[PDB]
Scaffold this motif. Structure first.
Motif: not given
Lengths: 142, 143
Positions: A29-30, A33, A36, A84, A87, A90, A117-118
């Motif tokens: 992920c960035r 969040h 995921f 998800s 998140g 990383e 994820c993003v």
């Protein structure tokens, strides 16, 4: 971008019991969040997000998989449903525990599990990534 | 894959005196596993297999009867009295009966035993066998 990599704990098996893993990949992920975004792309039962009975490459053998998670959250998916989990990290791993319970007939079970994820173009900004990567895991019996 | 041919001992009760022409009198339970692309082949041991012929030996060694095996009514197999294998590769596992090779008159016997090895076969007439399974022991009772 995306950076999805899968890994198998073996590749197959013929006697798959319940709670047995099959694939174990990792997602990334960035920024901040809470989910995921991961998918399998096989044969989900409607809105079933965290567990779905997948099918084999040839369509004749079903393999239930408990990928979901325990703690994941059904927040859409790409490709073929998905879920998800928190998140905040990383890079996390997600293993798919198969709830087979019995013996599976010889064949090949291919999964396309992957995630990004993003978030695409939504309220979060970050790095615009409207495309989530897919993965490829095969379970050939051998 | 592998090819693991499982087999189990069995006992039939029919005398040779009956078998006049190729008749099934002993369904050997053979179950292949993983042989999806292998030609399952069964072959009697050297003690019961001579020059390409399967024969049952007496329990006390006396007389012998040449017999050939057949899948009864399961799928297409390549017949032979010295080597038995299926031409069509794929999963299989069904009882293979035992026929007779031109009878033998039948002299008053008591028991007969024959050991059948399991595995796969490659090519033809070149004795391309390979032990991939288990050796079964078939017993025939006579009178």
């Amino acid at each position: 971008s995306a950076e999805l990599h899968l890994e198998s704990r073996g590749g197959s098996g013929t006697q798959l019991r319940d709670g047995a893993k099959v694939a174990t990949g990792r997602i990334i992920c960035r920024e901040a969040h809470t989910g995921f975004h991961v998918w399998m792309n096989e044969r989900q039962v409607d809105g079933r997000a965290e567990r779905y009975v997948v099918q084999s490459k040839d369509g004749r053998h079903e393999l239930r998989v408990r990928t979901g998670g325990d703690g994941w959250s059904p927040v859409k998916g790409e490709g073929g449903k998905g879920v998800s989990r928190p998140g905040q990290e990383e890079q996390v791993f997600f293993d798919v525990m198969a709830d087979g319970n019995q013996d599976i007939a010889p064949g090949e079970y291919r999964f396309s599990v992957g995630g990004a994820c993003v978030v695409p173009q939504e309220d979060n900004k970050q790095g615009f990534t409207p495309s989530g990567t897919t993965g490829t895991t095969k379970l050939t019996v051998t | 894959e592998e090819c693991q041919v499982r087999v189990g001992d069995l006992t039939v009760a029919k005398t040779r005196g009956q078998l006049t022409d190729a008749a099934p009198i002993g369904p050997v339970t053979v179950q292949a596993l993983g042989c999806n692309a292998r030609q399952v082949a069964l072959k009697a041991d050297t003690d019961n297999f001579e020059q390409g012929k399967f024969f049952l030996i007496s329990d006390n060694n006396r007389d012998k009867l040449y017999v050939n095996i057949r899948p009864m009514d399961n799928s297409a197999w390549t017949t032979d009295n010295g080597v038995f294998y299926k031409n069509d590769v794929g999963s299989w596992g069904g009882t293979i009966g035992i026929y007779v090779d031109g009878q033998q008159t039948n002299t008053p016997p008591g028991n007969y035993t024959l050991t059948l090895t399991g595995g796969y076969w490659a090519k033809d007439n070149k004795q391309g066998f390979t032990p991939s399974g288990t050796t079964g022991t078939t017993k025939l009772t006579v009178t």
